[PDB]
Enzyme design. Sequence first.
Site, short mmCIF file in Angstrom:
data_model
loop_
_atom_site.label_atom_id
_atom_site.label_comp_id
_atom_site.label_asym_id
_atom_site.label_seq_id
_atom_site.Cartn_x
_atom_site.Cartn_y
_atom_site.Cartn_z
N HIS A 1 -1.43 -3.28 -10.75
CA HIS A 1 -2.11 -3.76 -11.95
C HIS A 1 -2.23 -2.67 -12.97
O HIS A 1 -1.87 -1.50 -12.73
CB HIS A 1 -3.50 -4.35 -11.61
CG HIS A 1 -4.53 -3.33 -11.23
ND1 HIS A 1 -5.88 -3.45 -11.51
CD2 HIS A 1 -4.39 -2.12 -10.63
CE1 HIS A 1 -6.49 -2.34 -11.09
NE2 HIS A 1 -5.62 -1.51 -10.55
N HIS B 1 0.16 0.71 -11.82
CA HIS B 1 -0.02 1.50 -10.61
C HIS B 1 -0.51 0.50 -9.56
O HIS B 1 -0.57 -0.70 -9.85
CB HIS B 1 -1.06 2.61 -10.80
CG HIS B 1 -2.40 2.10 -11.23
ND1 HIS B 1 -2.71 1.77 -12.53
CD2 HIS B 1 -3.52 1.85 -10.51
CE1 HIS B 1 -3.96 1.33 -12.57
NE2 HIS B 1 -4.49 1.37 -11.37
N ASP C 1 -1.28 -10.97 -2.18
CA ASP C 1 -0.46 -10.00 -1.49
C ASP C 1 0.93 -9.82 -2.05
O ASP C 1 1.68 -10.78 -2.21
CB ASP C 1 -0.44 -10.28 0.00
CG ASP C 1 0.22 -9.17 0.76
OD1 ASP C 1 -0.22 -8.00 0.63
OD2 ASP C 1 1.23 -9.44 1.43
N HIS C 2 1.27 -8.56 -2.35
CA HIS C 2 2.56 -8.17 -2.93
C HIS C 2 2.78 -8.80 -4.28
O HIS C 2 3.85 -9.35 -4.56
CB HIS C 2 3.72 -8.47 -1.97
CG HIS C 2 3.90 -7.42 -0.92
ND1 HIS C 2 3.15 -7.40 0.24
CD2 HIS C 2 4.68 -6.32 -0.88
CE1 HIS C 2 3.46 -6.33 0.94
NE2 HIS C 2 4.39 -5.66 0.28
N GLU D 1 -10.95 -0.87 -3.29
CA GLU D 1 -9.75 -0.69 -4.12
C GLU D 1 -9.05 0.52 -3.52
O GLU D 1 -7.82 0.56 -3.43
CB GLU D 1 -10.13 -0.42 -5.57
CG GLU D 1 -8.95 -0.34 -6.50
CD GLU D 1 -9.35 -0.02 -7.93
OE1 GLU D 1 -9.98 1.03 -8.15
OE2 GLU D 1 -9.03 -0.84 -8.83
N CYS E 1 -5.89 4.71 -15.20
CA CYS E 1 -5.63 3.34 -14.73
C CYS E 1 -5.02 2.48 -15.85
O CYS E 1 -4.61 1.33 -15.62
CB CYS E 1 -6.90 2.70 -14.22
N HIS F 1 -2.50 -0.41 -5.35
CA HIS F 1 -3.39 -0.08 -4.25
C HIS F 1 -3.15 -0.94 -3.08
O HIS F 1 -2.57 -2.01 -3.19
CB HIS F 1 -4.85 -0.37 -4.60
CG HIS F 1 -5.29 0.23 -5.87
ND1 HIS F 1 -5.62 1.56 -6.02
CD2 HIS F 1 -5.40 -0.32 -7.10
CE1 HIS F 1 -5.92 1.77 -7.29
NE2 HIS F 1 -5.79 0.65 -7.96
C1 LIG Z 1 5.57 -2.27 2.51
C2 LIG Z 1 6.41 -3.06 1.47
O1 LIG Z 1 5.58 -3.29 0.32
C3 LIG Z 1 7.72 -2.30 1.05
O2 LIG Z 1 7.43 -1.06 0.36
C4 LIG Z 1 8.66 -1.99 2.22
C5 LIG Z 1 9.24 -3.11 3.07
N1 LIG Z 1 10.19 -2.62 4.14
C6 LIG Z 1 10.43 -1.20 4.29
N2 LIG Z 1 11.28 -0.70 5.27
C7 LIG Z 1 11.50 0.66 5.38
N3 LIG Z 1 12.36 1.17 6.38
N4 LIG Z 1 10.88 1.52 4.52
C8 LIG Z 1 10.04 1.06 3.55
O3 LIG Z 1 9.43 1.95 2.68
C9 LIG Z 1 9.80 -0.30 3.41
N5 LIG Z 1 8.96 -0.73 2.43
C1 LIG Z 2 -9.78 3.79 -9.87
C2 LIG Z 2 -9.02 3.88 -11.22
O1 LIG Z 2 -7.63 4.10 -10.93
C3 LIG Z 2 -9.19 2.56 -12.07
O2 LIG Z 2 -8.57 1.42 -11.42
C4 LIG Z 2 -10.66 2.28 -12.39
C5 LIG Z 2 -11.37 3.13 -13.43
N1 LIG Z 2 -12.84 2.99 -13.37
C6 LIG Z 2 -13.40 1.82 -12.80
N2 LIG Z 2 -14.70 1.49 -13.00
C7 LIG Z 2 -15.23 0.36 -12.46
N3 LIG Z 2 -16.58 0.04 -12.67
N4 LIG Z 2 -14.45 -0.46 -11.71
C8 LIG Z 2 -13.15 -0.18 -11.47
O3 LIG Z 2 -12.38 -1.06 -10.69
C9 LIG Z 2 -12.58 0.99 -12.01
N5 LIG Z 2 -11.27 1.30 -11.78
ZN LIG Z 3 -6.17 0.63 -10.10
ZN LIG Z 4 5.72 -1.35 -1.24
#
Ligand SMILES: C[C@@H](O)[C@@H](O)c1cnc2nc(N)[nH]c(=O)c2n1
Ligand SMILES: C[C@@H](O)[C@@H](O)c1cnc2nc(N)[nH]c(=O)c2n1
Ligand SMILES: [Zn+2]
Ligand SMILES: [Zn+2]
Lengths: 138, 138, 138, 138, 138, 138
Positions: free
Chosen positions: C17, C42, C82-83, C127, C36, C44
């Site tokens: 996000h 970026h 997810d993803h 997060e 952020c 998580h």
């Molecule tokens: C974890 C998923 O989001 C993705 O990054 C993913 C899926 N299969 C994978 N398989 C391998 N061997 N290495 C990875 O980094 C990898 N990575």
């Molecule tokens: C953690 C950083 O990378 C960014 O995502 C960020 C910056 N300050 C924040 N502040 C609050 N209150 N909530 C958040 O999710 C938050 N998040």
């Molecule tokens: Zn973030």
């Molecule tokens: Zn990945």
Amino acid sequence: LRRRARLSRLVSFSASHRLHSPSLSAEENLKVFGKCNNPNGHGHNYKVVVTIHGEIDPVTGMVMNLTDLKEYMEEAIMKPLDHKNLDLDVPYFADVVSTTENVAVYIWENLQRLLPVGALYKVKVYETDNNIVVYKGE
Amino acid sequence: LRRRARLSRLVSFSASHRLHSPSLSAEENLKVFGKCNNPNGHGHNYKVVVTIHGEIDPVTGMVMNLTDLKEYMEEAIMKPLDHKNLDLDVPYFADVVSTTENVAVYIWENLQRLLPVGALYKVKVYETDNNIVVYKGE
Amino acid sequence: LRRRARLSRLVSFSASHRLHSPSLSAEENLKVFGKCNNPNGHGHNYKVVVTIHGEIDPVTGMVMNLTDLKEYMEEAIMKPLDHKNLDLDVPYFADVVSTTENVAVYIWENLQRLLPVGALYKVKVYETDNNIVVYKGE
Amino acid sequence: LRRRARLSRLVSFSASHRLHSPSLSAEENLKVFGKCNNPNGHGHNYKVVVTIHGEIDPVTGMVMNLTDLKEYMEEAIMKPLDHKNLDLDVPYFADVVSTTENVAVYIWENLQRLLPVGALYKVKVYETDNNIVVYKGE
Amino acid sequence: LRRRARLSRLVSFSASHRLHSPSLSAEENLKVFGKCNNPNGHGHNYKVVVTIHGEIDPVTGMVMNLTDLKEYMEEAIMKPLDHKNLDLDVPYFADVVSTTENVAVYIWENLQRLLPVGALYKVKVYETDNNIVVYKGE
Amino acid sequence: LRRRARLSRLVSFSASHRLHSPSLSAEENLKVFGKCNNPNGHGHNYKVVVTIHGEIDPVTGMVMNLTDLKEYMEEAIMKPLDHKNLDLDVPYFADVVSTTENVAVYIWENLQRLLPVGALYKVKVYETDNNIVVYKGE
Ligand SMILES: C[C@@H](O)[C@@H](O)c1cnc2nc(N)[nH]c(=O)c2n1
Ligand SMILES: C[C@@H](O)[C@@H](O)c1cnc2nc(N)[nH]c(=O)c2n1
Ligand SMILES: [Zn+2]
Ligand SMILES: [Zn+2]
Ligand SMILES: C[C@@H](O)[C@@H](O)c1cnc2nc(N)[nH]c(=O)c2n1
Ligand SMILES: C[C@@H](O)[C@@H](O)c1cnc2nc(N)[nH]c(=O)c2n1
Ligand SMILES: C[C@@H](O)[C@@H](O)c1cnc2nc(N)[nH]c(=O)c2n1
Ligand SMILES: C[C@@H](O)[C@@H](O)c1cnc2nc(N)[nH]c(=O)c2n1
Ligand SMILES: [Zn+2]
Ligand SMILES: [Zn+2]
Ligand SMILES: [Zn+2]
Ligand SMILES: [Zn+2]
């Protein structure tokens, strides 16, 4: 030509067991295995880290596709071990004491029947956060 | 003369990416990378453990001053990778798939440009708690 | 009467996000959101703990069958999040900044559409290991 | 004849210390050790993982009985280090700087006085979750 | 007045069990309990966090001496549960299904027989890292 | 109205101390404080989770900007406590026993001098992974 790396995946399974050898007397078993000798058994949330090694694919960037590793581990660890009583539900342990060492060996062997030759590098088994065994096929 | 040891430091960075190779078709990419192929990407809180090895200083008791290691890692990992989109913000990944394997390789390479010769021992990258790559320059 | 307890289940999802508000200007968004606010995003590895409360059934010993809780969470969290890129793949975030707070609120609202009335007690979102939000429908 | 494995046990102890060398000036110590040079000291919850290796017993299934390892670690780590001030309560540190490196060395040495020859494989010391030293007797 | 605080202590015990109700038939128990209904059982490394509340003593600075809390937990949790089969070695589970909920309730009741009136605030039981129950005597 | 949530941030500080009350005699202090009464002290890697509560801003989506929360905690916790001997470097502990309870109270009081009125909800202090105190200003 190509870079080599180690790729690891972790999985956990729940199982019960009792450390006991019929080669040892009732009392020797108690002395040697202590609390782990409890007649009705006990259990653990085992954590297993399986490491394979090989060259990093120049196209996919994978030593081994994690999807495949998941499948191999499902077959080698989860299906026979998860939510099972090791000593009564796993034939291999009918005659082998189910120590962390032997669970690591059992998993190593299982994975070998399935993985490409030379792929498996290490099997690390955490019986608890404090008791760990690393087996590398030696 | 002097004892040798391995010294490790851990750091984590947040990044987004998408596993995709333009050498593969839209459908092959989906088959190979699955969910990780999501067109708009996804992300991770990467954990990196960098290990250097060397002799323990007889005066300071340090293999390498952790202050220096922090600085090298800040420069090699945090500045280029933290709060970034790997595939679009890191030139190295314009033509390389951003698997955990290649992120480990990228960090190894970055650290090599900076660290004293023979200092770097291993780069361990946790993409998630369950997917880990160890690269040792091989 | 019947005893009342709280039953929690933890899940992890991977997502990317960008923290950015269209109401704010380029400079304000940078001031407020800092790193952020990275243009290309970026990500998580989010961890979410869902807690439901109720009476412990006198026959099964469950507040709610964890199988059922898994399904609810699969539908309310895993499937839509997810993803995914939160701001582009999730309609809710089209006009809502994707802070940890709003992710907790979004998850709470999703679970409320599915869960038995009064079942949901708390939604906890990590997060990162260091940034946590708890939402209780208040 | 018999399979070989590595068996590890973790233990943690609480201790205070101050990084300071009388071979260095008051100011050099500050430059080199920074905050760790605080005159009145500071402390840590050290985590130690001790690994021994050997053949897996064909009867007991143990490389070494964990009961024995616990006892050796109690004697080599807990008795001299737990709830102690390293620099003032441990003779070995009267003349050696108490870096993580030297704590690992100290534990390795202590264990060697007690363990069967060839049993000890590695001593891993976590000063914090982020600073770790691995010493293997080299 | 005196300040009031909550003091918690964590312990882990190893145990096995089978989720099975004699009130239900073989098919119902399978439907309801699934894999946890494995005939020969399975197990876990349970983690239990006990929280007591009260005034912080003005001389010792303790809500309750942790030494005392340890003993209470040793008698209420470790002694009857550690390295046991819950359904065969613990009389309470003879006719009570051993879900995480009932384990939390059983522990709460044991602590109440020992602890000073009003001291006990909460019992938190992690069957696994993902399945958690909180019981507060309600 | 506006939704209300709890926002938490975790920090770790390193510190040493001796549990000792001048009101008590040498024997009482030993009885009461045991191993923590070690004359030359001992230490810990303290982990502190700070939770603030309030309305989720309708534009930024924050209860409080985590940047701000970081600064508050840096001033209230890190600056006065990190890499310090609690009983000699912190005036507050000159005549207050440094149990986990009093550390939680001290941190709560420091944050209250800085934070917006009503913002602070809870201060959670882990002296070790096993010894935890929660303080809520009661
Ligand atoms: C974890 C998923 O989001 C993705 O990054 C993913 C899926 N299969 C994978 N398989 C391998 N061997 N290495 C990875 O980094 C990898 N990575
Ligand atoms: C953690 C950083 O990378 C960014 O995502 C960020 C910056 N300050 C924040 N502040 C609050 N209150 N909530 C958040 O999710 C938050 N998040
Ligand atoms: Zn973030
Ligand atoms: Zn990945
Ligand atoms: C941990 C306890 O329940 C039991 O499984 C136990 C006791 N001592 C042991 N000792 C060794 N070496 N390996 C074990 O797996 C082991 N295992
Ligand atoms: C962590 C801090 O309190 C202090 O112990 C510290 C600072 N720099 C260090 N640097 C090294 N190489 N090893 C240490 O043990 C070390 N230790
Ligand atoms: C976790 C699984 O192996 C099994 O023990 C199981 C099945 N569903 C459950 N459901 C509830 N509510 N509580 C449990 O302890 C529980 N436990
Ligand atoms: C944990 C031990 O080393 C020592 O610091 C100790 C002894 N018992 C305690 N008891 C309480 N209530 N609080 C403490 O912080 C405490 N702390
Ligand atoms: Zn066992
Ligand atoms: Zn230190
Ligand atoms: Zn179970
Ligand atoms: Zn202490």
